[PDB]
Amino acid sequence: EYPTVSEIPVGEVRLYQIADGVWSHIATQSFDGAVYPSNGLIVRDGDELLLIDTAWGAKNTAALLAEIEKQIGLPVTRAVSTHFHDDRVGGVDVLRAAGVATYASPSTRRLAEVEGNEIPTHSLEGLSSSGDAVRFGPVELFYPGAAHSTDNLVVYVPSASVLYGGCAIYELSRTSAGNVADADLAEWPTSIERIQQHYPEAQFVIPGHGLPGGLDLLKHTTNVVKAHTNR
Numbered sequence: 001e002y003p004t005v006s007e008i009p010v011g012e013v014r015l016y017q018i019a020d021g022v023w024s025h026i027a028t029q030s031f032d033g034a035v036y037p038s039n040g041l042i043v044r045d046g047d048e049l050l051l052i053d054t055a056w057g058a059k060n061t062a063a064l065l066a067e068i069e070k071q072i073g074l075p076v077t078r079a080v081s082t083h084f085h086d087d088r089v090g091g092v093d094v095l096r097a098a099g100v101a102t103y104a105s106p107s108t109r110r111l112a113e114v115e116g117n118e119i120p121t122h123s124l125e126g127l128s129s130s131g132d133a134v135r136f137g138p139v140e141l142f143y144p145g146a147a148h149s150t151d152n153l154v155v156y157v158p159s160a161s162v163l164y165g166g167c168a169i170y171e172l173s174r175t176s177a178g179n180v181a182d183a184d185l186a187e188w189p190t191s192i193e194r195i196q197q198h199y200p201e202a203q204f205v206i207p208g209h210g211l212p213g214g215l216d217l218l219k220h221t222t223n224v225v226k227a228h229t230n231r
Ligand SMILES: CCCn1ccnc1C(=O)O
Pocket: 031, 036, 087, 148, 167, 178, 179, 180, 208, 209
């Protein structure tokens, strides 16, 4: 079963194998008095690993690298951060010093620099317009438009029908909005519609925080985002 927030102490990282050569990574963090789970992705590409998002902080990201070596034993050669918040780029300097090439859109890199968050080294071109998609090795990167943040990307693994929606997508047990300080509430449902229309075939859908599901997570998130818009 998928590890939930209560089952993971802060500092430890779990890996959940989804398909041949595709995992999620799950960590936990204390924030504003509560403990939150956090998801990322791992995708094999030949004999190297592509990492999607840090494990939320230097300590968790060191643990993530150690659990990868233990359970997979293939090197992480590139990483992509899906937006500029600390749960996605916090740990980038740990990755960089381990030899990982860190990537993010110019939008994400600009926003991280402004916030004082760690900044991925390389830039992802071709993603500035809503609906833009680019191939990145074993995944497609998709910019659906502004949602949880103006820069959020989603990641699709075509070999496995896995769609990592990041923080643009809510888990079912979340029935109220999360951190929406950087969000575009007016555009969020339209951006979700772009995800549905671009990956209607997705089978396994992973939120940025919590339990995966199917494409019904998109409808769930639209429901929650609209109830927050109206209250
Ligand atoms: C579980 C939502 C609260 N949260 C904590 C850290 N990041 C978030 C988010 O909404 O993206």
